[PDB]
Ligand binder design. Structure first.
Ligand SMILES: Cc1cc2nc3c(=O)[nH]c(=O)nc-3n(C[C@H](O)[C@H](O)[C@H](O)COP(=O)(O)O)c2cc1C
Ligand code: SF4
Ligand code: SF4
Ligand code: SF4
Ligand code: FES
Ligand SMILES: [K+]
Lengths: 45, 214, 432, 263, 87
């Protein structure tokens, strides 16, 4: 809680699953703005 | 490994079964929603990173399958897999040992840990263990290249490592339990062995500068 | 009017007050150390307001660039052509010994996103495709949970910080490439292709990811930009020498008693850099044969030169080196300098996209000719040839990887040449 | 009108806005040494042989990807540019296998001709060389991938003109193998032109392989008849028989490419 | 890719019989005007050479290349097909 210059305070690093990146990606869908309308469905389109 | 021309293997073939979990399709949808529509070819990088979490490596059945779902030509994802280093196209062990021997690590004798791990495991650099559990190979530096010479297991790293406790890194890994990920030495975050030479006073809070309206 | 004592950086001088992950990396400790205080007001004042602040500051490119940040950002502040303006963060950190990118993300990831948010107001960035190296899966997660706290608090996202700004920052993990650390290579690394550097000139100013304006800024420059908007250009410019000012993560390592990453003032003498913050160099200065002060792309310099050279960009230039990323590492006398960079030069070969001919054929050829150098199977002329082709690839590669690989070997030749000529007849006498 | 004025080693030349140096010095009759740029094929700027230094410019500029502006008097024959051409070439030359007597490009090789004009006279390479596994992508073109210069001219021609993606460049580092990874075959109806595109003997005609040498062929001009396009062709004959059908230049009808059937 | 052969004109003739000789395979020929290509600066002097010795001509205009307007930035686009994904 204090400055405690002899601490790491990153135990959450140890508590990270193998799917962690994509798991936060899945739950990051609510507060999203609209990806810009490039027009063509694909760069090839 | 060390190959850039595909040989159709009996087990790693285009016919190799390879699919995604119901939550995994959500992860891909979460992957593609970050990048704009009509430019979904950018999503090829993290989905390929996602690809080897399922099988354990990059099967060639995955590369063309992920090409068809991402509506990209097969050769484009073919290049993404072969270029990046951790994108391994050959099956690898459960513990992908990533020993660091880049100059800053070798200066602090990163050879000692490599020899120590070589002696116990018997298998040489690159090849898998006889139980295919660990895979020792020399690569470039992890990107954290300041502590004592460091190693990286799949997605779980270790730095501030000595030839004595590299023995103590694989022992419990062989047993199954996970060792402590991070600096083995007294560096909780990065602090020098002589304590900490900065950040003595408590950090300040808000209300500083406030130039005009700020 | 002049702070000649530009060493022993003070605690307030440390922009990242949670640099060692002391209080809390996440939102809970972010407000404790001063994050998210009047960020909206910084955005509300105006894009030119922070443009003036960075101009009166003049942040040198800490990612081995040296370009003042005020002009680089101002090249982009204009009414949008139509292509969505984006912000790009380069957190590859493939440089040997460089750790500045990591000491920001895992110990105050909000500090980086402060610089993206306050910068993005100047840039006009409605989004930021911030990138993180593939070897930092642990640390992309830490800023992903941190990005959530700011996303749901209104600070970033929908009308970011309560002022009209649909600014959303997106994180992309890498998959391993030191060449990806360049802006022109990371830009199509994000775009979903082989991470090769882009030819010039187009610019990030007009094109970029999917052909969009993209401000690539080093995390250290990004995350220091808060303090220069919260205090002003007087704070940044007061520390450090002319042009070279502010504070940078000096990553002391190599043959040092206590190798660590410390925020440190620049224009600092090398001796007290390793003495105060690390207890000295192993074996003292006499054992110290040379130092790589700036990083890989910064040539090493001899003991007769180190003494108290100041790590300000101008002073490294006269020292025939650069600031790089202040990833300072030391080799003792026991360490063979020919062997010391032997892994360094082959590291460059292992990390090269290989598109342009000078780099693809250069470092590997340099690797083989130096392999017989460290072994000694060469003639005295061979060092001169190594000189010639090193300058040959200099300024002839599409990107700065070749030039970044040129400086280490280039510096060694003109600095420890007699030692290079020493090892070869040592080979000749016994392998005769 | 909007056109801007530059010079090329003296003489003033009028140029279009956005003009590159390659299409700037050709107006006076200069071919900057190139190995990765084709006129009707997208810019690459990878071979680095187009490099030319101008006065008042400390660093040499990639000519094929350099938008010229006012007051750019390109110093074509400047010594630094001459040094740049020499070093870049010998860097291509380094890992090239010594197959000139056994490569069909001998006598019509871009690497050979350039190395005789903008080239040195002896090698400083004292190390081992590099070798690549040969591929096989159809019984109509021979792929000696060891002789490749990684100009990426093949991958662009396939992706932009042929409309296929069976070609790519795999690897990281010096290796940078160019091929298909998984074995495949060039199914393009315009696949034959990739033989003409490759500047080296990496891609060569299988039927013609070791049947004649360029300096004995009495070229003649005719047209395609397989297609109604009437593609302009160059018929290479020797001592009273036809060896190869080469595509002529006509731009608006066939450019410089012909169908695989007529090749 | 070199061009330094398209800069001049010639006086090429048409082909005649190329028959295989009875022996090892010489392509014996009976027309002397076979390997007599000329080299000319322009085309008006080319024809001027043609009728002085009374040879029927068949001229052809030089195929000067069409303009080669290219843009490196065009390879990296937003909604333009010229967005290139291969280098
Ligand atoms: C080989 C190479 C690697 C680089 N790696 C990094 C890196 O890891 N992080 C970074 O911030 N900049 C890196 N850079 C610098 C970038 O290319 C770019 O100049 C910089 O990020 C721009 O922002 P800055 O001016 O704030 O440094 C690298 C450059 C080169 C040539
Ligand atoms: S120097 Fe050239 S070949 Fe090497 S990584 Fe950079 S762009 Fe690629
Ligand atoms: S491609 Fe050219 S240089 Fe290479 S072997 Fe053939 S003729 Fe010789
Ligand atoms: S195979 Fe030929 S066209 Fe393709 S990259 Fe190599 S030299 Fe260029
Ligand atoms: S043509 Fe300019 S680099 Fe290949
Ligand atoms: K060819």
């Amino acid at each position: 809680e204090p400055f405690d210059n002899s601490t790491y305070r990153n135990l959450q690093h140890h508590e990270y699953s193998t799917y962690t990146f994509l798991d936060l990606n899945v739950e990051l869908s609510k507060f999203r703005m609209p990806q810009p309308s490039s027009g063509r469905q694909s760069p090839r389109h | 490994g060390a190959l850039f021309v595909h040989r159709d293997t009996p087990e790693n073939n285009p016919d190799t079964p390879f699919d995604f979990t119901p939550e995994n399709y959500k992860r891909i949808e979460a992957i593609v929603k970050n990048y704009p529509e009509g430019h979904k070819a950018a999503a090829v990088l993290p989905v390929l990173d996602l690809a080897q979490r399922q099988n354990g490596w990059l099967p060639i059945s995955a590369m063309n399958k992920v090409a068809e779902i991402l509506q990209v030509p097969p050769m484009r994802v073919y290049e993404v897999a072969t270029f990046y280093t951790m994108y391994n196209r050959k099956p690898v062990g459960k513990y992908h040992i990533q020993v660091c021997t880049t100059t800053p690590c070798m200066l602090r004798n990163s050879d000692s840990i490599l020899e120590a791990i070589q002696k116990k495991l018997g298998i040489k650099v690159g090849e898998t263990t006889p139980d295919k559990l660990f895979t020792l190979i020399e690569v470039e530096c992890l990107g954290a290249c300041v502590n004592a010479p460091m190693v990286q297991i799949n997605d779980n790293y270790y730095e501030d490592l000595t030839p004595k406790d590299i023995e103590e890194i694989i022992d419990e890994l062989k047993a199954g339990k996970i060792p402590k990920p991070g600096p083995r030495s007294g560096r909780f975050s990065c602090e020098p062995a002589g304590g900490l030479t900065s950040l003595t006073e408590p950090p300040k809070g808000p209300g500083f500068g406030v130039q005009a309206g700020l | 009017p002049k702070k000649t004592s530009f060493g022993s950086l003070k605690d307030e001088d440390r922009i990242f007050t949670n640099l060692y992950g002391r209080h809390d990396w996440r939102l809970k400790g972010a407000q404790s150390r001063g994050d998210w205080y009047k960020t909206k007001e910084i955005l509300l004042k105006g894009p030119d307001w922070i443009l003036g602040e960075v101009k009166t500051s003049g942040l040198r490119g800490r990612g081995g660039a040296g370009f003042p940040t005020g002009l680089k950002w101002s090249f982009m502040n204009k009414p949008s052509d139509g292509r969505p303006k984006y912000l790009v963060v380069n957190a590859d950190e493939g440089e040997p010994g460089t750790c500045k990118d990591r000491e920001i993300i895992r110990h105050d990831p909000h500090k980086l996103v402060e610089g993206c948010l306050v910068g993005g107001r100047a840039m006009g960035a409605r989004a930021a495709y911030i990138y993180i190296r593939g070897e930092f899966y642990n640390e992309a997660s830490n800023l992903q949970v941190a990005i959530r706290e700011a996303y749901e608090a209104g600070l970033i996202g929908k009308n970011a910080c309560g002022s009209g700004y649909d600014f959303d920052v997106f994180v992309v993990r890498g998959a391993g490439a030191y060449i990806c650390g360049e802006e022109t290579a990371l830009i199509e690394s994000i775009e979903g292709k082989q991470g090769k550097p882009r030819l010039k000139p187009p610019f990030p100013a007009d094109v970029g990811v999917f052909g969009c304006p993209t401000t690539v800024a080093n995390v250290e420059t990004v995350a220091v930009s808060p303090t220069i908007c919260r205090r002003g250009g007087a704070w940044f410019a007061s520390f450090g020498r002319e042009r070279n000012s502010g504070t940078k993560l000096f990553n002391i390592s190599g043959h040092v008693n206590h190798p660590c990453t410390v925020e440190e003032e620049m224009s600092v003498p090398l001796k007290e850099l390793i003495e105060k913050h690390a207890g000295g160099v192993i074996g003292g200065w006499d054992n110290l044969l040379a130092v790589i002060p700036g990083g890989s792309s910064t040539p090493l310099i001899p003991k007769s030169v180190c003494e108290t050279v100041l790590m300000d960009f101008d002073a490294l230039v006269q020292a025939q080196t650069g600031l790089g990323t202040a990833a300072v590492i030391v080799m003792d006398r026991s360490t063979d300098i020919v062997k010391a960079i032997a892994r360094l030069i082959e590291f460059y070969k292992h990390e090269s996209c290989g598109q342009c001919t000078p780099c693809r054929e250069g470092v590997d050829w340099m690797n083989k000719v130096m392999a017989r150098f460290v072994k000694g199977d060469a003639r005295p002329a061979e060092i001169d040839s190594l000189w010639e082709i090193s300058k040959q690839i200099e300024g002839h590669t599409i990107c700065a990887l070749g030039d970044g690989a040129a400086w280490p070997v280039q510096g060694l030749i003109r600095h420890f040449r007699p030692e290079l000529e020493e090892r070869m007849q040592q080979f000749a006498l016994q392998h005769q | 009108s909007n056109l801007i004025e530059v010079f090329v080693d003296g003489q003033s030349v009028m140029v279009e806005p956005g003009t590159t140096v390659l299409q700037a010095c050709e107006k006076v009759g200069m071919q900057i040494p190139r190995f990765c740029y084709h006129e009707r094929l997208s810019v690459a700027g990878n071979c680095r042989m187009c490099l030319v230094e101008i006065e008042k410019a400390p660093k040499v500029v990639a000519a094929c990807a350099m938008p010229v502006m006012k007051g750019w008097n390109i110093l074509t024959n400047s010594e630094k540019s001459k040094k740049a051409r020499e070093g870049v070439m010998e860097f291509l030359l380094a890992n090239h296998p010594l197959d000139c007597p056994i490569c069909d490009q001998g006598g019509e090789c871009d690497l050979q001709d350039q190395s005789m004009m903008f080239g040195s006279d002896r090698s400083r390479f004292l190390e081992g060389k590099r070798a690549v596994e040969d591929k096989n992508i159809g019984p109509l073109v021979k792929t000696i991938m060891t002789r490749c210069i990684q100009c990426t001219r093949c991958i662009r021609f396939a992706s932009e003109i042929a409309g296929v993606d069976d070609l790519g460049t795999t690897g990281r580092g010096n290796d940078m193998q160019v091929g298909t990874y998984i074995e495949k075959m060039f199914m393009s109806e315009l696949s034959g032109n990739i033989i003409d595109i490759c500047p080296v003997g990496a891609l060569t005609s299988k039927p013609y392989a070791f049947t004649a040498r360029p300096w004995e062929t009495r070229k003649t001009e005719s047209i395609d008849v397989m297609d109604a396009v009437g593609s302009n062709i160059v018929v290479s004959t020797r001592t009273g028989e036809v060896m190869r059908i080469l595509p002529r230049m006509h731009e608006d009808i066939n450019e410089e490419w012909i169908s695989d059937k007529t090749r | 890719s070199g061009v330094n052969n398209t800069k001049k004109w010639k006086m090429e003739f048409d082909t005649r019989e190329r028959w295989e000789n009875p022996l090892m395979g010489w392509s014996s020929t009976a027309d002397p005007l076979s390997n007599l290509v000329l080299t000319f600066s322009t085309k008006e002097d080319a024809v001027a050479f043609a009728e002085k010795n009374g040879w029927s001509f068949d001229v052809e205009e030089r195929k000067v290349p069409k303009p080669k307007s290219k843009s490196y930035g065009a390879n990296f686009s937003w909604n333009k097909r010229t967005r290139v994904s291969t280098k």
